[PDB]
Amino acid sequence: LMDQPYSKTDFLMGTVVTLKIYDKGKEDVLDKGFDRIKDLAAKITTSDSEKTSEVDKINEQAGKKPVKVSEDVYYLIQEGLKYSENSGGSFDITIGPLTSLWHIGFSDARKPSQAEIDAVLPLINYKDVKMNDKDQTVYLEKEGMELDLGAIAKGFITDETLKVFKENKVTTSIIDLGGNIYVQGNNPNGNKWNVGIQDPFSPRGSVIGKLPESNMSIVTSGIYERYLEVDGKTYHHILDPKTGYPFDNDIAGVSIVSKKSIDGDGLSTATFSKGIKGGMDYIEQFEGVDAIFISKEKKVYETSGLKGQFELTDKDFQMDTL
Ligand SMILES: Cc1cc2nc3c(=O)[nH]c(=O)nc-3n(C[C@H](O)[C@H](O)[C@H](O)COP(=O)(O)OP(=O)(O)OC[C@H]3O[C@@H](n4cnc5c(N)ncnc54)[C@H](O)[C@@H]3O)c2cc1C
Ligand SMILES: [Mg+2]
Ligand SMILES: [Mg+2]
C-alpha cells in the first residue's frame, strides 16, 4: 500500500468524479474504472443532445415497441422497479416526463404551468414498465412515458466501478462520484476511512462531521445542491409524482450508509418523501442500512445502527434524538 495514491479526476455526468487507488502497481486500473463509468453513463443518460442512449431509445418507443437493452441497463431498470414498488410509488423511475419538464439543475430549468404538470402526472406509473427476461427488452406501455434513472444510476455505477477494482485485485481505494462515495479497505495507516458527512447548507465538499467507515458506501441527498429559484420560491430536484412539485418537509439532507451503493442511492427518494421521523422509521426496516438525517433547523439524527458513531464538528448543528 502507498501513502500517496494514484488519483485521477474528470468531470462526468455533470459533476467532478475522482478515483483513488492505494495499491502499488495498479495505476492503470484508474483508466479501467473511468472507462467503465463512461460506458455506463452513455447507456443511461438522457442529457446528451447528440446521442441516443439506451434509456432514450426506450422512451422514444413508449407505447410503440419493446426495446432491446444490454445487461447493464436491464439490471438497473430491474432494481429501479423494485425500489419503486417498495416505496409505494413515491420513488418512481417513470417520473421521466415530470423531471424532464422541470429540468431542475440545468441551464433551462423552468417552473411549468399547472396544465403542463397535469398533462404528465397520468404518465407516471412504474407498473407500466413491461419487462421480458428472455428477449431482454424493456417496454413502456403508454405513449409519452419516460424513464429517469438518475436517482439510482450513480449508485449502480459506483458498485460497478468497485467490481472493476476488485477484478483487478485492488484492495484499498476511494470512489467519489459526487454525492456517491465508496471507501474500500482502510486508510494505509490502519485507521478506518473518515468519511465526511455533507453539509446540506454548503457546497459539495463542506462537511458537518466525520463517520469512520470501511468497505462501505455513503450516498447523500439534499435540497440546496440542485434547485430552481423563481419569484422568491425555490424548487429542489426531488419531485412528488402525485403532485408534480418537490417533496417539502423537514429534511435538508440525508446520508445513507450501506454495503452496496445502489441500495443507499435507491432508498434515498422514498426516505426523503417521509420526512425526518418517517424517513428514520423507513431506514430502520432495512437491516444493514443506516442514515444520518439533517433537519432544516440544523438538527442531526442517527438511526439505530449508527448511534454514537458520527463525530459532529460543525457547531452550527446540534445532535438530537427522537
Ligand atoms: C448518467 C447520468 C448523466 C448525467 N449527465 C448530466 C449532464 O450532462 N449534465 C448535468 O447537468 N447533469 C447530468 N446528470 C445529473 C447530475 O449527475 C445530477 O447532479 C444528479 O443526477 C442528481 O442526483 P443526486 O445523486 O445528486 O441526487 P439523488 O437524490 O440521488 O437523485 C435525484 C434525481 O432523481 C430523479 N428524481 C427526482 N424525483 C424522483 C422521484 N420521485 N422518483 C424517482 N426519481 C426521481 C431526478 O432526476 C433527480 O435529479 C447526469 C446524471 C446521470 C445519472
Ligand atoms: Mg444519487
Ligand atoms: Mg439516490
Numbering used by the authors: 37 to 358
Provide the publication's sentences verbatim.
A Mg2+‐dependent protein flavin mononucleotide (FMN) transferase (FmnB; UniProt: LMRG_02181) in EET is responsible for the transfer of electrons from intracellular to extracellular by hydrolyzing cofactor flavin adenine dinucleotide (FAD) and transferring FMN. FmnB is a flavin transferase belonging to ApbE family; it hydrolyzes flavin adenine dinucleotide (FAD) and converts flavin mononucleotide (FMN) to pheromone lipoprotein (PplA; UniProt: LMRG_02182), and divalent cations are required this process. Notably, the structures of FmnB in complex with distinct inhibitors, together with biochemical assays, revealed that all three inhibitors indeed inhibited the activity of FmnB by occupying the binding site of the FAD substrate.
As defined by unbiased electron density, FAD in a bent conformation binds to the central cavity of FmnB with the diphosphate nearly perpendicular to the adenine. The adenine of FAD forms hydrogen bonds with Ser126 and Leu275 of FmnB and establishes water‐mediated hydrogen bonds with the carbonyl group on the main chain of Asp184. Instead, the isoalloxazine ring is sandwiched between Phe142 and Met49 through the hydrophobic interactions. Remarkably, Arg262 not only forms a salt bridge with the sugar ring but also forms water‐mediated hydrogen bonds with isoalloxazine ring, which likely maintains the curved conformation of FmnB‐bound FAD. Moreover, the diphosphate of FAD is inserted further into the FAD‐binding pocket, forming hydrogen bonds with Ser257 and water‐mediated hydrogen bonds with His273 and coordinating with Mg2+ through Asp301. Two Mg2+ ions are present in the electron density model, and they are coordinated with the phosphate groups as well as water molecules. Glu261 adopted a rotamer conformation that removed it from the catalytic center through charge repulsion, and Arg262 no longer occupied the position of the sugar ring but formed a salt bridge with the sugar ring to stabilize the FAD conformation.
